[PDB]
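Limitations

Structures in this collection are predictions, not experimental determinations, and the ligand pose is part of the prediction. Treat each record accordingly. The example that follows, with Mesoheme as the small molecule, is included so readers can see exactly what is and is not provided: the inputs are given verbatim, and the output is the predicted complex.
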Amino acid sequence: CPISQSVSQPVDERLTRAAIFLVVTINPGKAAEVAVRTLCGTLSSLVRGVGFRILDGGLSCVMGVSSGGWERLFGDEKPEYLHVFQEINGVHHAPSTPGDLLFHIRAARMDLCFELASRILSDLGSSVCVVDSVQGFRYFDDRDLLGFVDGTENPVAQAAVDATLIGEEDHTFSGGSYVIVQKYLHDLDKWNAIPVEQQEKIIGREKLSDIELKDADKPSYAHNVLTSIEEDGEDVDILRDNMPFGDPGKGEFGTYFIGYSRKPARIERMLENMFVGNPPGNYDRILDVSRAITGTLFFIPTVSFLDSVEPQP
Ligand code: MH0
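Predicted complex:
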């Protein structure tokens, strides 16, 4: 019974007000690998020591390793679907960006995420380099910077469990997960020029009430239509924790997309229906105002696997 990381629990609890998305690369050498392995061993204790004193702080961290990271830190028994994220070239472009380790810190307060990130980066020193750091907040009643409530159709409880955790199909890595992270930059002027009823056709739901539109009055290119895929005639779900971010003083207004799935082809199928179209050409108009700048795939091991990792200096 491998204990799994808090992948779906935080979302289902609904207490995250702040998040930090740290993407780093391991520097060349073996001391770097030893330091990373020591952090893998002590990460759960670090999270407990940072977040225990704060009642209702809801601190949690999720660590993920990419394909290159895995190759360099562990052996060759790679997980089944751990590979380099593939760039997409359709009506819109989805780039593939570097990154070896991913830390997804969430808490009901910013200082907990800040302190955990500081502790993680101080225990790593020069063994790593930072490729992406992003501080995200909750925008009003779970809305994104486009004004729509995001996360309504996320699976909950057992549904999220079967959506994210790997089963017997890869018996060695049962309890793990896969994640795909993308960073978007929005043009809110262009988005706000469009009327509300049209934006609601583009999304598929109502703006203020957050009610799904009836199937008759939604276009084929509705976002919640192109992201609704089926396997063997049954609906399949992924788990999303998209987070708004930005700085008004520099002009940055963006959304960090993070998607969890036991099978990463589901997320890639959604990404192909969006950037290329389903049918081709019939792409997603959110991409008209949203630009993707990063994209990476990570494998999320179990807590049991992480705690049993030895530095082997
Ligand atoms: C690779 C997949 C994927 C990407 C990328 C993605 C990118 C984005 N999304 Fe969005 N989104 C994806 C997959 C979904 C799903 C699976 C659903 C659920 C639809 C359903 O009916 O089951 C969804 N998105 C649904 C939504 C909804 C409304 C319903 C809900 O929250 O459940 C909103 C407002 C939304 N998104 C916004 C956005 C924005 C904004 C971006 C990027 C800028």
